[PDB]
Structures are given as C-alpha cells and as structure tokens.
Design a protein around this ligand. Structure first.
Ligand SMILES: [Ca+2]
Length: 85
C-alpha cells in the first residue's frame, strides 16, 4: 500500500463508461469488490466479459481464472469487467 507507493489492469465498464484501475498481485477478490464499491459509490457485481460472453465472478477462484485468461493471452492488456447493479 504505502510500500506499493506485474500489476493487473482491470477495465471496468459501468453504464457505458470505462476506466482502468490497477491492482497489485496477488489480486484479492475482496479488494476488487471494495475498490468497486468505493469508486462507484455503490456495490456492483463483477462480470468478466469478452465480445460474446460474460460470466459473473463470484469468488476468488473465479477471479483467478479470469486473470489467467488475461495472462495466457498475448494481446489482452487489461481484464474487461462489466459492472451491473
Ligand atoms: Ca496478457
């Protein structure tokens, strides 16, 4: 935190607006959830999205698998997350 002052860049989309927020590894599900609530001023569900599919991320295991997609892809530079109330 203060020490922090390989990150995972998450591109959040909420109501058509996008922004990128970086998270240090290992990325904790509870930390992403907290950052979303803090930044957007309300809790929002995390949906990993590609051009065709989205999947709700329910827990650390789901988040780890989504980050692994990111890490296995040479072209993907951020993790696309659709936020829904
Ligand atoms: Ca990558």
């Amino acid at each position: 935190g203060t020490e922090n002052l390989s990150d995972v860049r998450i591109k959040f989309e909420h109501n058509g607006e996008r922004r990128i927020i970086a998270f240090s590894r290992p990325v904790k599900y509870e930390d992403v959830e907290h950052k979303v609530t803090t930044v957007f001023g309300q809790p929002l569900d995390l949906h990993y999205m590609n051009n065709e599919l989205s999947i709700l991320l329910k827990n650390q295991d789901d988040l780890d698998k989504a980050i692994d997609i990111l890490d296995r892809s040479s072209s993907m530079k951020s993790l696309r997350i659709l936020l829904l109330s």
